[PDB]
Amino acid sequence: APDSVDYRKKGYVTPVKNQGQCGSCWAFSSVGALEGQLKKKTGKLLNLSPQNLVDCVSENDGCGGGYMTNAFQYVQKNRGIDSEDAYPYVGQEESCMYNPTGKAAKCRGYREIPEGNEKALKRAVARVGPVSVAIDASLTSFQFYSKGVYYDESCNSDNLNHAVLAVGYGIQKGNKHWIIKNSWGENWGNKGYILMARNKNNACGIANLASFPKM
Numbered sequence: 001a002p003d004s005v006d007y008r009k010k011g012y013v014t015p016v017k018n019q020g021q022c023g024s025c026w027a028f029s030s031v032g033a034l035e036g037q038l039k040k041k042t043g044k045l046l047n048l049s050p051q052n053l054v055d056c057v058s059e060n061d062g063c064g065g066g067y068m069t070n071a072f073q074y075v076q077k078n079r080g081i082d083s084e085d086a087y088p089y090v091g092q093e094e095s096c097m098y099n100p101t102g103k104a105a106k107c108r109g110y111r112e113i114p115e116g117n118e119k120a121l122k123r124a125v126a127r128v129g130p131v132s133v134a135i136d137a138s139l140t141s142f143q144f145y146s147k148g149v150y151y152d153e154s155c156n157s158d159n160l161n162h163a164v165l166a167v168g169y170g171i172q173k174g175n176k177h178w179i180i181k182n183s184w185g186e187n188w189g190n191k192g193y194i195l196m197a198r199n200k201n202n203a204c205g206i207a208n209l210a211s212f213p214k215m
């Protein structure tokens with residue numbers, strides 16, 4: 001496992017999206033993980049449809065919340081997920097309108113990273129690619145994050161409330177971190193991204209609910 005990995009330098013990541021007010025972070029976190037695998041496998045980078053998950057994965061609660069796991073299982077059993085292009089994001093739950101012609105990627109199920117193991121999350125990010133993770137993003141400091149490695153000791157690893165994508169990891173001036181792609185738009189944090197503390201005893205529980213799609 002390399003000291004630092006950034007899948008943005010390998011074209012595994014599409015642009016930062018904006019989930020709006022809809023609590024569909026789990027949808028963007030899943031799509032992001034899929035996009036990474038789609039590029040790694042087929043060689044092409046495509047924008048997948050989070051709206052498709054929000055509307056079709058009835059195992060989740062749409063704009064209310066959901067799990068990346070059900071998201072992945074759905075894509076699998078449904079035999080595909082549409083492209084963002086064929087299934088535009090609207091920001092609110094609507095009736096499932098999946099269209100097989102607009103099918104952009106498939107999935108053979110998912111894998112889960114050992115609960116709370118950042119070292120295992122690290123190796124997974126290097127071996128597989130961008131991974132879907134759940135964090136505690138309920139803090140004022142998290143919302144007004146601008147630069148540097150994020151570390152708020154009020155974060156609670158037992159308080160997971162947001163799903164994001166780990167496109168890599170590394171170190172900035174000795175401070176180990178996780179390169180995290182958010183879905184609050186380009187104006188949030190550092191152009192939609194935030195460097196979250198790595199190896200600081202599972203800060204914000206970034207490894208308590210980590211998973212990635214098999215493809």
Ligand SMILES: *C(#N)N1[C][C][C]([N]C(=O)[C]([C][C]([C])[C])[N]C(=O)O[C]C2=[C][C]=[C][C]=[C]2)[C]1
Pocket residue numbers: 022023024025026059060061064065066067068133134135160161162163
């Ligand atoms: C995003 N956006 N946010 C909005 C709500 C918050 N909650 C969830 O999505 C969590 C999982 C995260 C911690 C990653 N899970 C959830 O609330 O699912 C509700 C559910 C799903 C399926 C059956 C019963 C309940 C993430």
